């Protein structure tokens, strides 16, 4: 008491259908905007022209981020060939990174942060699309859990990790996954480094790598002591569900080159829009 | 059964969904029907007043007087605020220096030329080594704060040009990939965290990150059109997936100043047209005290 | 067991099927959410935000792209000249592709509603002049002269007056919704043409540039909606991402 | 194993069996075996008229 | 029969699926339960129990392991010397592995909460002295001198006074949860460093040992929780169990 | 799982079966209908002409 | 020295802030820890060899042959529970046949 | 249907689970949601008082006076008690000798040396041949009892060292397996049931059983740190999967005394530092009378 | 950049022709004697 | 908060030591930094002097 110096405006609204149009006539300066402020023109039809009444029942439900994202998309293709350089071992460990396929990636990168649960579907077959009576095991190996070093590895005992056993002939396996980041949300962009220290050019592959997005390894194998005679192709589809998103940003307008960064082909910088001869001719 | 655990990713929002479920865990449920909420007034009109040019803002022992102002933008319609107890995680009592840190710091000045490409700065990188703010940022592991950005640029009624001043959260930079695109190169610490001097964009059209400048206005921004105004102001709230973070390893956002309409003037008129950046952190909070670390 | 009969659809995987799959981690509790500014719930919130239109999308700009972000006006020697022209079709290849609006509606098959284009004059303060901006509904090709274009929906803008101006493109269609317009049968869904003419002239005194530029910003209005979610043609997996 | 995909007007059409369009991140696709029963789905009234 | 359609997931065996399978012995009644002391319901009950920290985990101990269970203090000739140092990361390889807490959290991917370390002085009763124990949050490597370490969270302990003392490692993180820290990107989740310094000196009179030992006990506090159940790397089926 | 037994008819496709198939476009809203003269509900209306 | 764990918490040794902690303890309940199917046995019936070219096999029930699960159970001295057994069978290479 | 038989393994606990089921037997049901109960005060603080050194406990015709005590531990927070009728199974009336058996017996003394490995004793093996208790244990098939363990060790204020005194239920011993691990050897009766003389640990670090000494404190324990106390006391309730059992074939638990911090002292000070064990069974009950059997 | 750390005002002409800087009484003592070189530099007010 | 400065050694012939406040902390931690950036300062202090010795040692320090 003996010292006197020690004593968000915007909100939501539910709009199920597009706004309507009201009538007006031959009649305050609402046509000229001060776009220098960083605001979008609040001028509508009724201001610049004479209008009729239109009872607009067009629905806005399909543009809800949920209907936009909750569509299963390809995020990975894993192959286990029998003859070659890949894995004549009968098993494969895949670091989880969903940024290897553009269609989905570009959609997510529309936002800076995203939080959601997901439905993963596992479509498996031979490289030509044929199916055979082969038993498989998919296992989720969280960060810290021991990764299988072979098709015989004890890790396939899967006493605590979650594993799925399914035949290549059964329908696609399918499961639900919760929001697992240790942060409040996954983030497609992390303008920083994961650790302290000097950031010499040798460790610049560190830039942009966010541990909170690193969900571990996904392992798969044929279930047998002996090698399987079949080459295997596994396509993993992901369907986002129960999603929330923050901070929209410009959409990628240059082809993707790498999973972990926004590097672009500097010699061939594509223009966002097609070109024409003259500004006065279509 | 039907009664379950509360473990769905969308359980803490004022937007409900109708679902169907038979497993004990909520995230197994379907996506459901989408409610139809909307807040188009935080991007299209996050301006001040939801004689505007005339002004004067004071914070700390510093005061700015702006008159050819274009009003003020409140990023995403939210004011900076100390971190609330529900969101907080770290248990130690944070230090809230107030006046010694929440004030106006005026960084180096750049010169606008008829051929300038554009510049950018990172936050809080720009102040990590300035005044009391910087010192606190070094002695503490955790930091959290908001910002007031004031960009200044004068010119006669005979000059012309337009700067787009924008804030881009998590401004991750990319390289031109060896040009051919076969080299997986990366930006050096000096480019990702240029310090208080800021850096120059090499390819403004794609913001040195494979994204269209043409769409940057989807971010809190303001224009400095010489014939209308000579300064821009943007209040920025803290944005991150965590309540507090390192002021050293993570830059919450970058500030970009790009000449979208090039500077021009008849020869004989003043050719030295500077651009100055003054920023003030707001509601600065620090925690996790230890010895000073510069990086 | 209970009498059941499998029906067609059995065993299929529909990418857009919204069902219930078993959870892999029972009893798991996600890190609680915290407040983050800037949450969006519907894409439309974004489409209402003005982004820059590349009206100056010339073949000669491609190597100096920054120049596409604005087109010029200069002292005319002839009256009523045409300054620039472009289609209002938002989902069509052209100037609109550079806007967040155009990119987003390319993720939907159809759209409906009014659009708005705001023009900002970035010339010197001493420059004055009036421009005629018109929107010509479907049917007529590019108006040959200002006197023809003037017969359509238009606005007459003055710089000295206000630095920015907003042209509204009223939803004037036969159908309730338009599919993306392109050459061929789908030209049926064209929205129309926007033309910018010199009402008077770009006047400037001694001491100021005789050429200045205008930035065009575009976005959708409140009555705008889209339907039939599809994949965008604007992104490609030209090669493998490593 | 087969894949049927609906490519609405404007969506990129597959140019090959390897085409990226089969990523089907937004278009609706159905995956079914020639041995499974016939695939079956419901379609809404999609005309713009 | 009733119209049904098989959905993806059909026929699969998810090890963590919590369903209902048919009973093999109908009408069977298990031997009734009796009271047995020591029932536990949640692993956390165990994590709150102090177990011994192998702070003295040297390569030279491996053949005489009992020596790892305690480290020494002795009459110093120099002021402010460093007695011992170690990381507070509980799920990390090191001293913590010897504690029931560390072993258990290795069965979970992430954790959160405060930890406590209790030091017990087992020297003679005639020995006295004060030690400075500090916890340095992330960022700084091992403090070079006591004057640097002193800037962090610390406690100043005196033997003569009490035989045991408890240092609390407050949960001071950016994220609500930490994943197990290890070299590399995951060093991001490091908890920090604990250092033990000589505040004054180990003083003893004629007749008593000039070297004694300290036992470090560690456990979690009430706000400690773990999530994302996984398999431990700390056990192996090196060969076949017969 | 719940005890069930497949009965004859399983897997068959009856062209006149009036069942429920999954929707390909979730949240889709068809262009609203407008008034059009000449709507007919039953073929008999025509046979009387 | 008593055999008790320190009842000293944050508020005692340092100055703290109020934190509304909603972290859930449901996943560390012994039920969620154990109710995860694990391998307890591998039985083989080969056709050519020393094992069982007899076509049948008798296995004495002992679940202690695999560490992952065993170590978890041996965390406790006594345990009482019901169980769900799942039988995954195939040829030694993972192939399946109408047997 | 839905109404069933009460045959689930978790039907007699004050902790309910929500389940789903369609078979007549309860054990077929799912695991269900886990309630969130906790009792962290039976392991972390199973001490006496939930002038403590000063004391005196009397039972039978024996009395102990402890003053450099470190309080008293009640194992798992439970007091010994005669077996209740609900848990009982054997129908004959048990004999409850009281005073002649529930009293303090003081077994052989061991000598603590600077290089001592550590010792252990088995219960009730240690008393099977002592006084009236032993006799009853021999004449009866079934036995049940609790225990009071008092370990004593004096030393001057110039000596130092620390003994960890712990109780380990079902203390099953293992062999070093021929060293190489290819020999499936087993401990002889003399090692598993050493009698009243107890035995010596050969590999204390792993408690001669492949488990870390470092974690033994997860068991009812107490420390004897020479500079603080010179005795430890632990009350132990009966622990078994059965109400009564043979005192001959089954040892309910073992008592371990291990020098975690080795004994040390300056030469000239008393070098003979003994350790003495005094134990008192509590609530001893016997049943199934017949002739005496020694094993 | 150094001076900016003290009490300041940022003035614009086009805006207003005049501007007022306030020199807050920031002293240790309740009163200052006239400052001059030497011991009395103790009562200096500061620099503009 | 508590800052722990250098340690001195007490010898049978020691004369005695002294420190000045706030001189001692002008260059330590955040306190020092604030002292440097500001013209004016005001504060109170908690002084804790420590010295252990066996029950067989003797001597007396006057802390003032
Ligand atoms: C047995 C089923 C196993 C299925 C487990 C799959 C878990 C996948 C969790 C989704 C994580 C979202 C992706 C997060 C981050 C991005 O990939 C990062 N950019 C990679 O650095
Ligand atoms: C037709 C289905 C047959 C399935 C019957 C399986 C019954 C298995 C009961 C589980 C018993 C738990 C294991 C008990 C004891 C340990 O194995 C012992 N250490 C072995 O000596
Ligand atoms: Cl296996
Ligand atoms: Cl959703
Ligand atoms: Cl919906
Ligand atoms: Cl400068
Ligand atoms: Cl410059
Ligand atoms: Cl460029
Ligand atoms: Cl269009
Ligand atoms: Cl594919
Ligand atoms: Cl020192
Ligand atoms: Cl850790
Ligand atoms: Cl649960
Ligand atoms: Cl004796
Ligand atoms: Cl002995
Ligand atoms: Cl040993
Ligand atoms: Cl000294
Ligand atoms: K049946
Ligand atoms: K039927
Ligand atoms: K089942």
Author numbering:
A (entry chain A): 2 to 8, 19 to 38, 43 to 297
B (entry chain B), H (entry chain B): 11 to 60, 79 to 323
C (entry chain C), E (entry chain C): 1 to 242
D (entry chain A): 150 to 198
F (entry chain C): 1 to 49
G (entry chain A): 51 to 149
I (entry chain C): 147 to 194
J (entry chain B): 131 to 194
Question: What does the paper behind this entry write?
Answer:
Enterovirus 71 (EV71) and coxsackievirus A16 (CVA16) are subgroup A human enteroviruses (HEVA), small, nonenveloped single-stranded RNA (ssRNA) viruses whose protective capsid mediates cell entry and humoral immune responses.
The sedimentation coefficients and λ260/λ280 absorbance ratios were ∼160S and 1.67 for the mature virus, and ∼80S and 0.64 for the empty particle, indicating that the latter does not contain RNA, and SDS-PAGE showed that VP0 is not cleaved into VP4 and VP2 in the empty particle. Diffraction data for inactivated CVA16 empty and full virus particles to 2.7- and 2.65-Å resolution, respectively, were collected at room temperature in situ. The natural empty particle is not expanded. The natural empty particle contains proteins VP0, VP1, and VP3. However, the inner surface of the empty CVA16 particle is much more ordered than the expanded EV71 empty particle, where the entire 69 residues of VP4 and residues 1 to 72 of VP1 are invisible.
